[PDB]
Symmetry: C3
Subunit: 111 residues, 3 copies
């Protein structure tokens, strides 16, 4: 199992959501964050570093779904301009659905 955390431009949330869902993702968590990358929050063209509003998407999936999730995030979030965002993939040891106590694959599965 892996957690895929992607930080993207806020306006791109709707496209990303639809792309992931059409590819069979059935679970995701979003929050609002502030960040900067290489360009220190500057869109123009003095080292005054600024934060911009971004959305952080977190999606837990089995290993065989990882490439698909990354493909759809990249296709939905990209515009070609600096600040398009970053994706981080990390291990998940165990997943549990609280209502039923199901584990791992079963806790990750559809309706």
């Amino acid at each position: 199992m892996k957690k895929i955390e992607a930080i993207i431009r806020p306006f791109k949330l709707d496209e990303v959501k639809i792309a992931l869902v059409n590819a069979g993702i059935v679970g995701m968590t979003v929050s609002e964050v502030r960040g900067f990358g290489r360009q220190k929050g500057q869109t123009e063209r003095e080292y005054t570093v600024e934060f911009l509003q971004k959305l952080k998407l977190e999606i837990v999936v089995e290993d065989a779904q990882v490439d698909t999730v990354i493909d759809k995030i990249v296709a939905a979030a990209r515009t070609g301009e600096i600040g398009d965002g970053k994706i981080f993939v990390s291990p998940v040891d165990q997943t549990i659905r609280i209502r039923t106590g199901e584990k791992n694959a079963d806790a990750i599965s559809a309706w």
Copy 2:
């Protein structure tokens, strides 16, 4: 050492907090997030985000089952949307005031 991330309904925070603390688990970070699961945010083909809280609790391996047990007991109810728990590895923990590491940065006293 492991991180336990639980996404629960916001109004269950107080029960979870009490369940965990009575069992000796004393350190937690909480954040407001929005989410959906396999019902795609429906309480009744649209997809909606609902308000949840994310709890993050870092503990020693020996305490993981305890943390899961208490979060489940406090937050399970029987209605869809009760939440989901993710367990991941932590390689190092450091207490900023002291520079204490690992087991020492995670326990009391």
Copy 3:
């Protein structure tokens, strides 16, 4: 690659930022959180209050770096964030398998540099 997740006092963000960027660590994500540590949100602790718990506002900083930069990052956060009082903060380091820059599709080292 590791993710460094540092929970600190909100007023220490600026100093932590400057110290990271001056050290060539350029890229971070910040968010507002609430928490307690072993003092359970209490700076005044009373008989029986061990089982009461208050949440305080903190800031969570998340910084993904290469393995070789982890000590530098911890050092800089600890020096900028430390006040000497309970509640100064706590840092969690965890593995990251992959990092990808969305704009270019570049990966790992090149997506952190």
